[PDB]
Write an enzyme that holds these catalytic residues in place. Structure first.
Site, PDB file in Angstrom:
ATOM      1  N   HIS A  63      43.685  39.157  34.664  1.00 41.19           N
ATOM      2  CA  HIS A  63      43.759  38.782  36.069  1.00 41.19           C
ATOM      3  C   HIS A  63      44.092  40.038  37.224  1.00 41.19           C
ATOM      4  O   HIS A  63      43.781  39.807  38.362  1.00 41.19           O
ATOM      5  CB  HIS A  63      44.488  37.653  36.616  1.00 41.19           C
ATOM      6  N   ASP A 129      50.757  30.336  41.743  1.00 43.57           N
ATOM      7  CA  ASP A 129      49.688  29.500  42.084  1.00 43.57           C
ATOM      8  C   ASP A 129      48.506  29.264  41.116  1.00 43.57           C
ATOM      9  O   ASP A 129      48.242  28.204  40.578  1.00 43.57           O
ATOM     10  CB  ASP A 129      48.700  29.841  43.258  1.00 43.57           C
ATOM     11  N   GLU A 242      54.251  25.822  51.504  1.00 41.73           N
ATOM     12  CA  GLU A 242      53.109  27.155  51.486  1.00 41.73           C
ATOM     13  C   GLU A 242      52.189  27.063  52.560  1.00 41.73           C
ATOM     14  O   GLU A 242      52.813  26.713  53.762  1.00 41.73           O
ATOM     15  CB  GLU A 242      52.337  26.868  50.390  1.00 41.73           C
TER      16      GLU A 242
HETATM   17  C1  LIG Z   1      42.571  34.665  42.670  1.00 40.45           C
HETATM   18  C2  LIG Z   1      43.803  34.868  42.449  1.00 40.45           C
HETATM   19  C3  LIG Z   1      44.887  34.251  42.749  1.00 40.45           C
HETATM   20  C4  LIG Z   1      46.127  34.887  42.340  1.00 40.45           C
HETATM   21  N1  LIG Z   1      47.172  33.926  42.417  1.00 40.45           N
HETATM   22  C5  LIG Z   1      48.554  34.625  42.039  1.00 40.45           C
HETATM   23  C6  LIG Z   1      49.904  33.666  42.431  1.00 40.45           C
HETATM   24  O1  LIG Z   1      49.613  32.522  42.702  1.00 40.45           O
HETATM   25  N2  LIG Z   1      50.919  34.399  41.642  1.00 40.45           N
HETATM   26  C7  LIG Z   1      50.882  35.580  41.154  1.00 40.45           C
HETATM   27  O2  LIG Z   1      52.075  36.023  41.052  1.00 40.45           O
HETATM   28  N3  LIG Z   1      50.083  36.367  41.073  1.00 40.45           N
HETATM   29  C8  LIG Z   1      48.810  35.838  41.516  1.00 40.45           C
HETATM   30  N4  LIG Z   1      47.568  36.757  41.348  1.00 40.45           N
HETATM   31  C9  LIG Z   1      47.754  37.988  40.554  1.00 40.45           C
HETATM   32  C10 LIG Z   1      47.687  37.798  39.093  1.00 40.45           C
HETATM   33  O3  LIG Z   1      48.959  36.761  38.908  1.00 40.45           O
HETATM   34  C11 LIG Z   1      47.743  38.767  38.251  1.00 40.45           C
HETATM   35  O4  LIG Z   1      46.705  39.901  38.342  1.00 40.45           O
HETATM   36  C12 LIG Z   1      47.868  38.064  36.858  1.00 40.45           C
HETATM   37  O5  LIG Z   1      48.736  37.072  36.795  1.00 40.45           O
HETATM   38  C13 LIG Z   1      48.067  39.021  35.958  1.00 40.45           C
HETATM   39  O6  LIG Z   1      48.290  38.626  34.914  1.00 40.45           O
HETATM   40  P1  LIG Z   1      47.814  38.799  33.544  1.00 40.45           P
HETATM   41  O7  LIG Z   1      48.643  37.692  33.061  1.00 40.45           O
HETATM   42  O8  LIG Z   1      46.434  38.734  33.349  1.00 40.45           O
HETATM   43  O9  LIG Z   1      48.360  40.201  33.213  1.00 40.45           O
HETATM   44  P2  LIG Z   1      47.779  41.856  33.835  1.00 40.45           P
HETATM   45  O10 LIG Z   1      46.958  41.895  34.878  1.00 40.45           O
HETATM   46  O11 LIG Z   1      47.342  42.165  32.586  1.00 40.45           O
HETATM   47  O12 LIG Z   1      48.903  42.723  34.648  1.00 40.45           O
HETATM   48  C14 LIG Z   1      50.263  42.754  34.367  1.00 40.45           C
HETATM   49  C15 LIG Z   1      50.598  44.343  34.073  1.00 40.45           C
HETATM   50  O13 LIG Z   1      51.516  44.077  33.034  1.00 40.45           O
HETATM   51  C16 LIG Z   1      51.015  44.751  32.012  1.00 40.45           C
HETATM   52  N5  LIG Z   1      51.382  43.707  31.054  1.00 40.45           N
HETATM   53  C17 LIG Z   1      50.511  42.719  30.342  1.00 40.45           C
HETATM   54  N6  LIG Z   1      50.913  41.907  29.494  1.00 40.45           N
HETATM   55  C18 LIG Z   1      52.344  42.539  29.505  1.00 40.45           C
HETATM   56  C19 LIG Z   1      53.419  42.234  28.620  1.00 40.45           C
HETATM   57  N7  LIG Z   1      53.505  41.271  27.719  1.00 40.45           N
HETATM   58  N8  LIG Z   1      54.567  42.853  28.584  1.00 40.45           N
HETATM   59  C20 LIG Z   1      54.334  44.001  29.652  1.00 40.45           C
HETATM   60  N9  LIG Z   1      53.447  44.336  30.512  1.00 40.45           N
HETATM   61  C21 LIG Z   1      52.494  43.518  30.279  1.00 40.45           C
HETATM   62  C22 LIG Z   1      49.467  45.138  32.168  1.00 40.45           C
HETATM   63  O14 LIG Z   1      49.023  46.009  31.368  1.00 40.45           O
HETATM   64  C23 LIG Z   1      49.594  45.467  33.640  1.00 40.45           C
HETATM   65  O15 LIG Z   1      49.959  46.681  33.939  1.00 40.45           O
HETATM   66  C24 LIG Z   1      46.229  35.930  41.689  1.00 40.45           C
HETATM   67  C25 LIG Z   1      45.340  36.767  41.558  1.00 40.45           C
HETATM   68  C26 LIG Z   1      43.892  36.408  41.951  1.00 40.45           C
HETATM   69  C27 LIG Z   1      42.606  37.225  41.634  1.00 40.45           C
END
Ligand SMILES: Cc1cc2nc3c(=O)[nH]c(=O)nc-3n(C[C@H](O)[C@H](O)[C@H](O)COP(=O)(O)OP(=O)(O)OC[C@H]3O[C@@H](n4cnc5c(N)ncnc54)[C@H](O)[C@@H]3O)c2cc1C
Length: 491
Positions: A63, A129, A242
């Site tokens: 994400h 969210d 919100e």
């Molecule tokens: C439409 C939209 C809505 C969103 N809404 C929200 C929201 O309501 N709340 C919010 O907080 N965010 C929100 N986001 C941002 C989003 O939360 C993050 O990009 C998303 O949660 C990333 O999550 P991920 O779990 O895919 O991890 P990643 O994108 O992979 O990001 C986390 C970072 O942590 C590292 N990482 C991944 N897994 C681990 C692990 N297990 N241990 C250590 N490091 C790790 C990754 O390499 C990266 O550097 C939103 C984004 C979009 C596009």
């Protein structure tokens, strides 16, 4: 490397790990690791430590917007293969939270929510969210949503973590055991180690949610009312605050059609006063209650709690749907999204914290002028309380004020737009960042992405030395999540 899972090189595997939701980077690693647990992860880390150039970045759900979970020529650890590794609930007599569920750093929040509610009657109390995100992914940033004003973000709702540091050590940490690590990892952008397990707080899950959206035309009125609501005594007011900023127009994706909750009550603009800007403000509220509750009693309580809000009568939409649909409501936008072709195009989003003393200058130019026609999605902006946040973690929020606002432009890309479009979007985000820096706006980015050391030192401010001490202690070769771009790998 000795791994039980399957490693993949090139092909679709490398392809996927080379892309994210933002859609602006395709950095390929040498391989993708599927760890059947912490040792497979420590193996990956150690291989990098002995190697000449490999780095190591854990991936959650993808994400992210700017490639923080990528490793050019390095290793990407597919935490997805560790998702079901933990699910252990324990009780807390220590008052406050009820129980906990030790869960994998690789678990997705939506799946956690379901299992927890569909077998135990308990749920975490601080969320994001979007639930199609991982536990380790959000815990590496902060994990913010509408419950944070009352319970702090998700990083404030964990009491223990198992972490594989940049040294390759597999460790368990908390405020007591290996504490500097515990606080370093929380909100630490994957810089000090991978989170394989987290002890997530659980409160009894509520039965129902009254979802409310009311409309304001005046900011300081909308903002004063929002701050007043989140400043109320615990459990005396709503359980969700919100709201956003939509355009004052019929644009089904940027305007008033984005406000109503259910199809049988639409937005009638003939209720808006003539002297309102090209933009209106919605206040979004959620009240928890039990299904045993009499509707007449609940209706009387909501009126009590909303009775002192200055919104506009006739533009307050509401619905009562189950706690779980209310939490997966973002699936509703993911649907329109796919139905409209942008859920698939680039998303050059903008996310930031603008302390109270500065949010005012933001509605002034940014919302009402810079992006007054919207960004093709929601434009949130709700107040939060600094008090809930612990400054021991690696998180970064505005410098001054007991109340700061979370910001975030949810930019989408209509299938038509030329590629030049995504450039202008990025350019405009940079501009907003410029306009804020030049006017001494006390803002800090959330999910920060900078490409120079001088931008990172500014962002971390007086906490840069601490961020550097922690790096030197937990990932001295700088092999972890090099995609954040704060430290460069060792030569
Ligand atoms: C439409 C939209 C809505 C969103 N809404 C929200 C929201 O309501 N709340 C919010 O907080 N965010 C929100 N986001 C941002 C989003 O939360 C993050 O990009 C998303 O949660 C990333 O999550 P991920 O779990 O895919 O991890 P990643 O994108 O992979 O990001 C986390 C970072 O942590 C590292 N990482 C991944 N897994 C681990 C692990 N297990 N241990 C250590 N490091 C790790 C990754 O390499 C990266 O550097 C939103 C984004 C979009 C596009």
């Amino acid at each position: 490397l000795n791994i039980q899972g399957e490693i993949l090189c090139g092909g679709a595997a490398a392809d996927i790990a080379g892309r994210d939701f933002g859609g602006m980077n395709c950095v390929k690693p040498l391989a993708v690791v599927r760890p059947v647990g912490p040792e497979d992860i420590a193996g990956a880390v150690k291989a990098a430590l002995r190697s000449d150039k490999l780095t190591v970045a854990a991936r959650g759900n993808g994400h992210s917007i700017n490639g923080q979970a990528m490793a050019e020529g390095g290793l990407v650890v597919d935490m997805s293969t560790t998702a079901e590794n933990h699910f252990e609930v324990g009780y807390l007599s220590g008052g406050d939270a009820t129980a906990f569920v030790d869960v994998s750093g690789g678990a997705l929040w939506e799946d956690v929510l379901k299992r927890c509610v569909s077998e135990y009657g308990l749920a975490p109390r601080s969320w994001t969210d979007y639930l199609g995100l991982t536990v380790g992914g959000t815990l590496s940033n902060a994990g913010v949503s509408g419950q944070a004003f009352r319970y702090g973000p998700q990083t404030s709702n964990v009491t223990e973590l198992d972490v594989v540091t940049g040294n390759g050590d597999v460790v368990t940490c908390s405020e007591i055991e290996n504490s500097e690590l515990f606080f370093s990892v929380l909100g630490g952008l994957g810089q000090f180690g991978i989170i394989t397990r987290a002890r997530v707080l659980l409160q009894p899950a509520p039965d129902m949610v009254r979802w409310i959206r009311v409309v304001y035309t005046e900011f300081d009125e909308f903002t004063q009312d929002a701050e007043w609501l989140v400043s109320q005594k615990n459990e005396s007011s709503f359980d969700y605050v919100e709201g956003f900023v939509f355009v004052n127009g019929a644009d089904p994706v940027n305007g008033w059609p984005t406000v109503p909750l259910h199809p049988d009550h639409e937005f009638d603009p003939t209720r808006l006063p003539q002297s309102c800007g090209s933009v209106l403000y919605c206040l979004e509220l959620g009240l928890h209650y039990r299904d045993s509750d009499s509707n007449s009693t609940i209706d009387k309580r909501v009126e009590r709690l909303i009775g002192r809000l200055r919104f506009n009568e006739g533009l307050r939409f509401e619905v009562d749907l189950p706690y779980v649909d209310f939490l997966l409501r973002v699936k509703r936008s993911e649907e329109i999204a796919k139905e409209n072709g942008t859920w698939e195009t680039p998303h050059p989003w903008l996310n930031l914290f603008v302390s109270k003393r500065d949010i005012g200058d933001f509605n002034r130019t940014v919302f009402k002028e810079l992006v007054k026609n919207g960004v093709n999605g929601p434009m949130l902006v709700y107040p939060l309380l600094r008090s809930r946040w612990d400054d021991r973690t690696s998180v970064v929020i505005p410098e001054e004020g007991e109340i700061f606002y979370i910001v975030a432009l949810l930019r989408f890309v209509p299938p038509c737009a030329k590629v030049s479009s995504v450039e202008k979007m990025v350019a405009q985000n940079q501009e907003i960042v410029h306009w804020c820096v030049k006017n001494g706006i006390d803002y800090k980015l959330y999910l920060p992405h900078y490409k120079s050391q001088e931008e990172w030192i500014r962002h971390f401010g007086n906490r840069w030395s601490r961020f550097v001490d922690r790096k030197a202690m937990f990932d001295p070769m700088a092999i972890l999540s090099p995609g954040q771009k704060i430290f460069n790998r060792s030569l």
